[PDB]
Design brief:
This is part of a larger assembly, with 5 copies of chain A (371 residues).
Chain A (H helix, E strand, L loop, with lengths): L9 H8 L7 E8 L6 E8 L12 E4 L12 E11 L8 E8 L11 H10 L6 E11 L32 H14 L3 E6 L5 E10 L2 H20 L2 E3 L14 E6 L1 H4 L4 H12 L2 H7 L7 H5 L14 E3 L6 E3 L1 H6 L4 E3 L8 H12 L13
Parallel strand pairs in A: 1-5, 11-12
Antiparallel strand pairs in A: 1-2, 3-4, 4-5, 6-8, 6-9, 6-10, 7-8, 10-13, 12-13
Helix pairs in contact in A: 2-10, 3-4
Bound molecules: chloride ion (CL) (5 copies) and manganese (II) ion (10 copies).
Membrane topology (chains A, B, C, D, E): Lipid-anchor
GO biological process, one term (chains A, B, C, D, E): protein palmitoylation
Catalytic activity (chains A, B, C, D, E): L-glutamate + NH4(+) + ATP = L-glutamine + ADP + phosphate + H(+); L-cysteinyl-[protein] + hexadecanoyl-CoA = S-hexadecanoyl-L-cysteinyl-[protein] + CoA
Chain lengths: 371, 371, 371, 371, 371
């Protein structure tokens, strides 16, 4: 069942969107709220099209309304971090992804980009590249997956993965609209597929260098939510939307450095993985917005997943925590895939943990300060 | 009853599809899954429009999710085989039909194109031409034919074949969209008609030379599934969707060589047919994805069909296994029609069997190796 | 689709029908209108329960409202002919079947009972017995048969005749209610069955002596219409409600005399049939309210019917105009079945024609006067 | 979705059924049609309540309308075999289960009772007792199980077997009505349970001696169909209504003789089973109306079933062809259960095969004549 | 939204239930399945009304279908434990609550009554009395509470507790039917009220002596499930059906001995409570079918609940783990209320834990063997 807003005449809205807007420009400021997994937005009018992110003014909002502050000093600040073209309003309107700061200009608790950028600047010469496979499930407003029988289940899994046809793929209109919307916005979207669970989908973001991975994925998530809002359905990043023999949603992260991409870079890939072998618990905590409880429902070691309590790595191992692609093993260079991160992970937390363990050789149960 | 996805606002999707996509190009990789009758697809982003099939990278997928592998080494490989223009995304986006290979680069079990291409290259000088009349039935998501009364039947057969009017043709919107989509994509689609069963239709693919017959028909099937997915109905290639006095769906194959097309080519047509007379059982096994059990429900010798257990040929014989058209008999040259193949046949299997029996003079119950 | 009246709360009506009515008695006067196939009724209050038909007063109605008169002298008269218990109002209320007379006390044009009674009194000593198998079709208010798919057809005929189950018998609630209502009223109803056409049914009336056959069948028809009115569906006696391979409705008439029932009564059965052989056209005109045009659609000689233009008789011959039952042939006594009469026949016309031809040895194209 | 007849006001019908019917009695004649699995019925009026089965007259019907005859001599004969009280019409109305005979008084092809009674009379002194567990599935008129999501599936099997609650048991109203209707009719119904498949149920018939097993089960099936017709749903005895991981429906047959019931009767139980071990193919053909093709879909050896191609017996073996109950093994006396027969089996065929193999020591592939 | 079974005509079922059943009697055998919280049932026919529980035969079922066994020896045994009058079938039909035993006659894992009865027999002279306040929530088949707005919430809590009116009490028809059904069955039901959460209700069972507390509550739960099944809604005993500011469901247990009920019995009440003070963790594990995880969602110390991690007792303390009623404090005698147990608790586990701690002075983390 789709939302009441989706039943409003879309024809009418278009007619208003066809009006020439004139000299004023709309900027939509996007930020992460106090849950560390929700996105918030609002719009301001600018006098002219900004040429770069530097021209965008800082803004503010009430943190007590976003689970981000309490009491008197609840005013929070928005500092623009990345700019994109607005696919919902078209050029010259912009999407402005912002960092959140408290009233005293300290980073907000869900502001993970502030530290993530400092870590990325530390290893800039090694040029870390990331890719994330964002899995998501389309849901009706009733909390049941989009397209599934009322209070019931479709046929067993098997035909839905990369499926085509009215009985195989549910809500491809949303997937096509999102893909185009991301390409128009300047998001580094690498592809899409239908997932094993019906009404479950995936888009790939990358390759992205350093802090660009978190910006591109967060804005790609925002566009998906905004596109799904137009169609009147919900995109969930819950790692296990439906209990039982229905696939979880993960965010598989591909990681490579300049050394790993160069000839005979497999030795550096293996060195990074054995470093990851010794910090499995540290990464599980970082790979989930609430410390790894959500990912416990997904990482059961059954549905092409690994076990949350046990670390494993191998070439072409779908069930392993870390997978080296078969081609990467043959070519002796390229990347490796971390399959642990949950679909509702913060990419700033995930990328920072990979750099700290693999590149800065950090150890122990707490992140190093100033290094 | 049409699917929940078909009830999403199509206006909205269009608005996103009207965005200029920019420099990136979408390629949809299409392959045959482990059932030998189902199609799978997913999309990747390319940096630029590929000029030919050679520029497309090889890709991969999980075979355990497509009924094509089990256990550890379930990664399969996609090798592009034919390129077409994407009618769902428009130029410069592409449809990429691929062959499937196992982890050790051996052909997949449902990869029949690999052997079919080798056979076609063997008889290239004789220039074999094919044409296939693909019959299909439109169905609602409930498994009942599109347009038929709820839990009931329309009037008896007689007015539906090539019918026009709301009470004669069911789901012509899908037929028109598919026809155009195929013409835009570069599929060699020769025409369409309404079939004797209401909601049953047919499109002709050809003439196609050698391996092009399987590529064009498989992609034409994919476009039909994708077009039907947009309208929220199902296209079935079941050889007998409805039991009783309702027509089956076949894939009648027209075959000719350079010798048969030349003046007094009827003698070569008759020589090919008498060779087919001695291998009826071998062809029945090849003409069906599960060895000829599905086609047993269609080949009953009643509804303009032949008997599955008996071979027959004649000029202008609709009830025969092989038909020589009346014009071909008069002109003493042209083609002959194999009416045996089921609607859910693999064209690679059908074309290969015709070349082996008629052109390579193969005998016995198993295909010759290396010849 | 059932009528708006059927959607009124039946619970409420019952509550009013549970009131004790007291000393006054309701009599429903029933008569045949000017179409010769429609029934009309209205109710009057009596001071007390009538002990016999003789105690019921004569009544009147406006003939211009029943297709039975025009101009100034349109008042018609109702003379009670047969009394029955009212199954819709229960004892002591009555159903009063009446003959219709013009303003000058001459019989109305659709009053066939007046002449039929005189003929029956002429052959009273021979004690003619009749039985009629009244076939009818239940229809929705839309003119489509009850239970059939909207604007469509059920499966082919074969499982519906005497069928049980939700997919075999349509509207058995009406059949059960009618059967009981007739038994309560004192109608000589001999049994029921589901017919070959789905939603088609039959009840048997008889054996009835002389004029009782027309009274019992006409009142049985009235009760069926009144019972169907309660359920909000229509009972049609159309001889061919649906064109094509769907069975017609007939009213098969069984006829025997005292001579035919006695030992070695087959010789008298054969003598009656050979007399019927010479008057096929006279009986076809009498067996239909509009001279035999309706029965032309049924008597096609295909669906267990005979040909309207040709007479035939035989033992156990379903396709014959006249059938001698196999048991009657073996026992050399009993009855014979006239299968010619249409479902919308007037039983007074049918019984009178059988007596005139078989017992009074009448010949020619017009009924004898005074004999 | 329930039938159009089920939407007619049941209140109204009751009001007519509350009328006192008077001196006339209704008898519903029930017989098996030409499919050997379908039941047919019709009603006649009797002058008085029959005291025993001997007082019921023989009747007849058209065999060409029941798949039981063709051409001229299509009249078939009904000979009453067992009488029961009518639960749909109440006392004194009767249900009359009849044998079918051709025009020349030879048994009809689906008349298996005629031979079954002769075999039972042969072993009368050994007093064979039978019990059958009739499994069935409730279905909507759309051919989907009653209560299941539209075009979908309920949760996996596990909670439905003997389940209580709106999410566990589907259509218990039908089960309760059938159970009572059978108890009122005088059917030897021993109990009911909810089956593993949701909307699937079972009733036990027995213990019944000799020919009474077929009469009681066939009439119990008729009452279920008639009760389901009232509720507007379909009872199917298809051995595998839904493909996949959904339980089949069987008719498990319990068999014991006077010797097997007596002290140390286990030796006679084992002797009967080893005789059954040598005739597995003969029994599989008899245990299915179409020679064992339907039961091939059920007897897969997976869902608490045995393999159709392999015979096995054991104590407390659910997966065996023949099961000796654990209590019977301990007490060294009682019965054994044949778990092979399909839900749509003819009990006359099943009981006759058990007596021929176990008691008459018949061998070979054809039944013995006159013994 | 109510179930498809609830939409079947209840009038029809009644008509069948009005048939006199005759000499045979129905017994419904009820048992606890392998989840320790679900109930299963099936029916058998008895020859006569059983006078006591001793006359009921032992029965059996397949444990592999009830989550209670696996592999070959999956047959389980039902031993009748308590008898009640059947409120769904009326006298003389019975409800038979049974204990479950394995194939080797050892108690089933969810058979807690076997040990509970032995403990109750040990302290029989002290005459322990119990009372349980069973809270439950009515839910639609969609998993949303009965009566709540579609995908939404009613007004805040405050008017629903003991509320009257269409906007205050949801599904009182079920509560009235259950209350009467329990009184007819012979269940010791002491009263009902509407709970603070709308669509949430409670019934009190008791006072019951020893093992009667578990029998009465389990059968009361079965009747509620069966009554809710008739109305087409679900009764859930989930301790927290809806997250947030919506009340949990508990099963508050009242406990008293002969000493506590006698004059100046408060000293024995205080001695029992201080013994309970030292075994808080042991009781939390016993008070929940899955070791206390479900009750963690309810025992938050906010909505009139206590904290799961902390024990507290006091006079008239709603927020305490143990409450002494104000009247009991004043009269210096009576009972105390354990407010810890979850709504889905097993009463056999709860009553046994209270007797072991308070009366048998058991200590440690495991129950004493043989004492
Ligand atoms: Cl905004
Ligand atoms: Cl895709
Ligand atoms: Cl009136
Ligand atoms: Cl009937
Ligand atoms: Cl039951
Ligand atoms: Mn994936
Ligand atoms: Mn991956
Ligand atoms: Mn065709
Ligand atoms: Mn053709
Ligand atoms: Mn008839
Ligand atoms: Mn007849
Ligand atoms: Mn069973
Ligand atoms: Mn059994
Ligand atoms: Mn309470
Ligand atoms: Mn309390």
């Amino acid at each position: 069942a789709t939302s009441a807003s989706s039943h409003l005449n879309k024809g009418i809205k278009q007619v208003y969107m066809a009006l020439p807007q004139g000299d004023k420009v709309q900027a939509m400021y996007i930020w992460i709220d106090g849950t560390g997994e929700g996105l918030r937005c609002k719009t301001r009018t600018l006098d002219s099209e900004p040429k770069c992110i530097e021209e965008l003014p800082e803004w503010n909002f009430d943190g007590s309304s976003t689970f981000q502050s309490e009491g008197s000093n609840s005013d929070m600040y928005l500092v623009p971090a990345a700019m994109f073209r607005d696919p919902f309003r078209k050029d010259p309107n912009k999407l402005v992804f912002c960092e959140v700061f408290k009233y005293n200009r300290k980073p907000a608790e869900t502001n993970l980009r502030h530290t993530c950028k400092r870590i990325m600047d530390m290893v800039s010469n090694q040029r870390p590249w990331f890719g994330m496979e964002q899995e998501y499930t389309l849901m009706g407003t009733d909390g049941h997956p989009f397209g599934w029988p009322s209070n019931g289940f479709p046929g067993p899994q098997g035909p839905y993965y990369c499926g085509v046809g009215a009985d195989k793929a549910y809500g491809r209109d949303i997937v096509e609209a999102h893909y185009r919307a991301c390409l128009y916005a300047g998001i580094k979207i690498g592809g899409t597929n239908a997932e094993v669970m019906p009404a479950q989908w995936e888009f790939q973001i990358g390759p992205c260098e350093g802090i660009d991975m978190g910006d591109h994925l967060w804005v790609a998530r925002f566009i998906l939510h905004r596109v799904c809002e137009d169609f009147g359905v919900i995109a969930t990043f819950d790692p296990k939307p439906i209990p039982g023999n229905w696939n979880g949603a993960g965010c598989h992260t591909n990681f490579s450095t300049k050394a790993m991409r160069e000839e005979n870079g497999l030795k550096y890939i293996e060195e990074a993985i054995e470093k990851l072998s010794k910090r499995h618990q540290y990464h599980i905590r970082a790979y989930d917005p609430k410390g790894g409880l959500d990912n416990a429902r997904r990482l059961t070691g059954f549905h092409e997943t690994s076990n949350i309590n046990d670390f494993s790595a191998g070439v072409a191992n779908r069930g392993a925590s870390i997978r080296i692609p078969r081609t990467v093993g043959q070519e002796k260079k390229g990347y490796f895939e971390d399959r642990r991160p949950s679909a509702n992970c913060d990419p700033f937390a995930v990328t920072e943990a990979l750099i700290r363990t693999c590149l800065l050789n950090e150890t122990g149960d707490e992140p190093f300060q100033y290094k």
